[PDB]
Each structure stands twice: as C-alpha cells, then as structure tokens.
C-alpha cells in the first residue's frame, strides 16, 4: 500500500503539471524532492 503511494506520486503527475496546479496536502525517504 505504501509502495503504491510511492508509485502514484512518482507517476506522470509531475510530468505535465498542467497550468500550474499544486497539491495542498493537509494531515499529520518520503521527504525528499
């Protein structure tokens, strides 16, 4: 389940980055750029 999240955040989401839309996650080596 963790590895799935790792893959989802490292998918092509940052590839296109359409029209400067950011992610504002709110909650409580995952901290690297």
Give CA–CA dist 18/28, Å, rounded. 27
Name which of 19 and 32 has its Cβ closer to another protein: 32
**At 7, is the secondary structure helix, strand, or coil?**
helix
Is 4 a binding residue for another protein by CB under 8 A? The answer is: yes
* Separation in Å, CA 11 to CA 2, 5, 16, 19: 14, 10, 10, 18
Is 29 a binding residue for another protein by CB under 8 A? The answer is: yes
Is 33 a binding residue for another protein by CB under 8 A? The answer is: yes
Is 3 a binding residue for another protein by CB under 8 A? The answer is: yes
List interacting residues with another protein (CB under 8 A). Answer: 1, 3-4, 7, 10, 29, 32-33
């Amino acid at each position: 389940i963790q590895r799935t999240l790792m893959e989802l955040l490292n998918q092509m989401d940052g590839f296109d980055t359409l029209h400067r839309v950011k992610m504002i996650m709110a909650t409580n080596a995952l901290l690297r750029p």
